[PDB]
Amino acid sequence: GSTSTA
């Protein structure tokens, strides 16, 4: 799984 925010 992966997650990113900006």
UniProtKB/Swiss-Prot annotation:
Signal peptide: none annotated. Used by snowmaking industry to promote ice nucleation for artificial snow and economize water. Sold under the name Snomax by York. It is found in: Cell outer membrane. Contains 122 imperfect repeats of a consensus octapeptide A-G-Y-G-S-T-L-T; further on a 16-residue and a regional 48-residue periodicity is superimposed. Ice nucleation proteins enable bacteria to nucleate crystallization in supercooled water. Belongs to the bacterial ice nucleation protein family. A structural model is suggested in which the ice nucleation protein displays a symmetry related to that of ice. This is Ice nucleation protein. It comes from Pseudomonas syringae pv. syringae. The chain holds residues 707 to 712 of 1200 of the full protein.
